Design a protein around this ligand. Structure first.
Ligand code: HEM
Ligand code: HEM
Ligand SMILES: O=C1C[C@H](c2c[nH]c3ccc(F)cc23)C(=O)N1
Ligand SMILES: O=C1C[C@H](c2c[nH]c3ccc(F)cc23)C(=O)N1
Lengths: 374, 375
């Protein structure tokens, strides 16, 4: 789907992301590529302040604007959070802020690092002639040595890639409903269920490549934002763009379009009600690439798959729909065990998005389980 | 597919006036809200109701009427006489069928604009046109609350806007087909329809008085979200266990102004500000098909950007006439807000929707005025 920017094999992930920016931005690229060293040495904040306000006009293609976004995004996190020990910058300099906020308005994304930057556009394959496995992949940017950003960003991307198998069959579901093709629909539903069951084994890889201490005490600090954050009470000031401090949420997979589009497809109203969970997931759509929030829109505008399956007294169609729902609760249940190991236990010795964490995740999982027909 | 009517726009065409005889007990209370409240009989009559199933509400129109009936009863039950003696728990016999019908229609279990304006009307004579004299509301809260005047004038503005909404596809097609002259003619036609909506808004003064709005109607239209009177929200007994929060009714829930702001690229919902957050949140208080419509206009190429890139004074002037008609509507609205809210409040504060009134309204008007290409 070139209209919604959905790839056949990588789904919502930006296929083959650009590694190098035009030579005119070698100054931005030097900093971004040297964050572990410039942060640890205390040279980072001074290298950002010494920068000259570069124009965003030399970024022509979409892949170059997305890489620049990832570059300026990682530098903004590093600048604001420093060494990640509580000494924060409340103001972002104009020579970095002005081109960052301009590029953000151009790509319709807020001026903060989002999941679409650090995960969907933060990757490469080692050997282009080899498959999309963890051993054949790497990330473009990290924050600090030992932060486990490779394992963390890649495991997220791999889940995203595993979801692409199910994403491509969505139009088969909608065409079968209108054309009233029950057998085609049942087959499409079983196929979605199959794919979501396979994505659960991809989640298992987090244990192998991410250590709980490094995620909690380091990576989570850098991915955090300035909305409801006591550290930056009124938000961040983007010098030369807005005279007032703007609040933006930190990165999260709540910004992933995958789980949101399966909730929409299956008629799981996660966005329904006035709860905090429904509120966050709705707000995170404005942190997604515009083409992806437009895709979510278009899926919502279609007639309900849940209502169609219910309007028929067909046990076979009901079992296939439930197989898709059961696969989602199983993903969300395993995910709760991850958050216990990576956030709750290390905290005993808040996440990157800023939610109530456990209550938020339990409310979203509870809603999914309640969609079960049997 | 977007439940947009050619003549009434976002309003529900010819709403149902009566429910099947099975719900007569709901209808009696809803139809006699002024009398039952005044006599202190409302809360008792509600508590004596049997729990009725929603299965006898078959068609969309009968489901929309039932939502209006249960929504009015709920506001009456929670607010009572309108002086502070509040109810924090809504009985199961009403709360259960109300949330079921609400879940089915994808609307929160609180009276919204789509109920009390869009589905709360009729024509006296079906052969005569849609004029105030040929129309009436179906439900009221109190004797002298001016609810007929209030709801009907909002509806009449909503209907005046219907004429501009039907030319939206012409605008997008003209852009796609690169038909400069068609686009210009379509933009001037939207502007003309928006200018006529302002003349309809003037009728407010003859059918609504400030004391009745501020001290009565405003009380019943209010909700339980950030409200000190129901700090935790409302308990929907037998449906949810915890109290839930929902904002009160407002024309922030109207899809009219929201769709013209999206059409013209007036970034009202963009950013994390109070005004933007409120207008985005009110989309989940709109019927699903109307929230889908807004969302789908956002996915279309920018009318603003198309106009800005052509170096065509004629096109810019037609675009600016559309923006100007919205600033004119919002500037008139600030005078209505002084007459119906600021003056009565000083003779003794929020509106029904719960925003920080003056800031919110000035931020929305400012964002519209700043969209003008030329002053
Ligand atoms: C180190 C491992 C992980 C931890 C500690 C973790 C933590 C969290 C937390 C705290 C939230 C709540 C939002 C917030 O306030 O930040 C969340 C939401 C979410 N996470 Fe994870 N997560 C991890 C890995 C993953 C992976 C690998 C994916 C796969 C793409 C993922 C997908 C999601 C989704 C979709 C949500 C939104 C809630 C839902 O739809 O159920 N997470 N995660
Ligand atoms: C007695 C008459 C009226 C009063 C006192 C009044 C008051 C208000 C207030 C207080 C708000 C802010 C939202 C809130 O906190 O509640 C508001 C918003 C709004 N009102 Fe009015 N209003 C009145 C009549 C109308 C009418 C007839 C229309 C036309 C349909 C209208 C259209 C709007 C719109 C579109 C908004 C959203 C803000 C915007 O887009 O500018 N209002 N109104
Ligand atoms: O605390 C967390 C981690 C988790 C998450 C999973 N994949 C991510 C990619 C980027 C990012 F900033 C956060 C995440 C989340 O949603 N909250
Ligand atoms: O306080 C107010 C009144 C005004 C308004 C205009 N038409 C309405 C229809 C229903 C409703 F509950 C409120 C309104 C608004 O947006 N805030």
């Amino acid at each position: 789907s070139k209209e919604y920017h959905i790839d056949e094999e990588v789904g919502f992930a930006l296929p083959n992301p650009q590694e190098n920016l035009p030579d005119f931005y070698n100054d931005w690229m030097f900093i971004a590529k040297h964050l572990p060293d410039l942060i640890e040495s205390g040279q980072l904040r001074e290298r950002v302040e010494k920068l000259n306000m570069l124009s965003i006009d030399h970024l022509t293609d979409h892949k170059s604007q997305r890489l620049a976004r990832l570059v300026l995004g990682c530098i903004t996190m590093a600048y604001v959070w420093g060494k990640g020990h509580g000494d924060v910058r409340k103001v972002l300099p104009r020579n970095i802020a002005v081109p960052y906020c301009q590029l953000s308005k151009k790509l319709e994304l807020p001026p903060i690092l989002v999941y679409a930057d650090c995960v969907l556009a933060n990757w490469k394959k080692k050997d282009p002639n080899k498959p999309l496995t963890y051993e054949n992949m790497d990330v473009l940017f990290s924050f600090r040595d030992g932060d486990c950003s490779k394992g963390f960003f890649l495991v997220s991307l791999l889940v995203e890639i595993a979801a692409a198998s199910a994403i491509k069959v969505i139009p088969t579901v909608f065409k079968a409903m209108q054309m009233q093709e029950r057998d085609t629909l049942l087959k499409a539903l079983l196929e979605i269920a199959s794919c979501l069951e396979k994505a659960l084994q991809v989640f298992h890889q987090i244990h192998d490549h991410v250590n709980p201490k490094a995620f909690f005490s380091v990576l989570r600090i850098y991915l955090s934002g300035w909305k409801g954050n006591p550290q930056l009470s009124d938000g961040l000031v983007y010098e030369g763009f807005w005279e007032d401090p703007k609040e933006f949420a930190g990165g999260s997979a709540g910004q992933s379009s995958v789980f949101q589009c399966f909730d929409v497809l299956l008629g799981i109203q996660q966005t329904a009600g006035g709860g905090h969970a429904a509120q966050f997931l709705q707000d995170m759509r404005r942190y997604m690439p515009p083409a992806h929030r437009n895709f979510l829109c278009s899926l919502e505008s279609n007639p309900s798959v849940r209502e169609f399956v219910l309007s028929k007294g067909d046990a076979g169609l009901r079992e296939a729909y439930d197989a898709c729902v059961k696969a989602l609760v199983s993903l969300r249940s395993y995910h709760l065990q991850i958050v216990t190991k990576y956030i709750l236990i290390p905290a005993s010795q808040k996440g990157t998005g800023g939610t109530d964490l456990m209550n938020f995740l339990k409310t979203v999982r509870s809603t999914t389980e309640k969609s079960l027909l049997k």
